[PDB]
Symmetry: C3
Subunit: 123 residues, 3 copies
């Protein structure tokens, strides 16, 4: 395998929260129901959602951000240990196949009012 793409994204947390508040429908456009919940069932907070938004932007960048990708066709899920993972379906999986992507790597971080993500596509 080789690296197919890398993506990075930085998202200002306060601004992201404001966008979610302004348009009730936005959260459901960006996130699957599972992503909006913490492991124990409570509602995921704004900084953690901003990090997932950054991850999806970074994933899109790693794929060359073509038209027609759906936010809901990329899913951030969480291993028991807390580690974030990417699962791709539909439009995102189709684009990944065009480029020969077999494996996805992600990491997330938030501090100082920002959320960040890096994504590497490999295949």
């Amino acid at each position: 395998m080789s690296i197919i793409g890398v993506g990075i994204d930085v998202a200002e947390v306060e601004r992201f929260g404001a966008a979610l508040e302004r348009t009730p429908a936005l959260a459901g456009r960006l996130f699957l129901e599972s992503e909006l919940l913490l492991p124990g069932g409570e509602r995921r907070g704004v900084a953690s959602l901003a990090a997932r938004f950054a991850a999806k932007e970074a994933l899109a960048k790693a794929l060359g951000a073509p038209a027609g990708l759906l936010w809901t066709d990329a899913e951030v899920w969480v291993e028991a240990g807390g580690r974030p993972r990417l699962r791709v379906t539909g439009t995102v999986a189709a684009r990944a196949a065009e480029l020969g992507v077999a494996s996805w790597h992600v990491s997330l971080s938030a501090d100082a009012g920002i959320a960040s993500a890096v994504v590497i596509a490999e295949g």
Copy 2:
């Protein structure tokens, strides 16, 4: 292939703009003429230039930042879809050859007053 190096850089946009304003010659020292223009021919803005500066710093870091690298020997170019790409020549290409680098991967992001870049060298 294997990873040869990784680089990351974060640049404060306002400070970068101030540096460009202070010394008229600076932009031409850091950037090729093509980098200073948007696809349609207008002048590239300060945040986008800061992201390209970060990319060049990150590229230097991925190569172990030896003396003698020229800023103008690394070029950020743009695919039709908008995706940034690195082209290396001269001093930067020579150092890349010393290390066996065959392929370059870059991503850029700006928000919250900062521009950022990640670069991976592979070979």
Copy 3:
């Protein structure tokens, strides 16, 4: 080889410094004696220490952050040219072996009140 994990971390410098000041023992819990010194023997500054903290957090993330990792089992050392490098021992090396990690790549950056690091584990 393939990518085994990636980590990113962003650390607010001022807050990190405040934590070090609040608990005298903290620096020695996070850092080996060598990490606390500059090449010439003077004391390493807070932003540079924050970048090393971010590197260790990013390394932990690349390994899936299991319980039992010691901060002192990851060491940031510096090549003559200034390039940062990771050396792993003990608990961190043991976890790396569980995952098959052969090679480590790191880069550090600080600006705009933040320190950042990216780490890639390969094997």
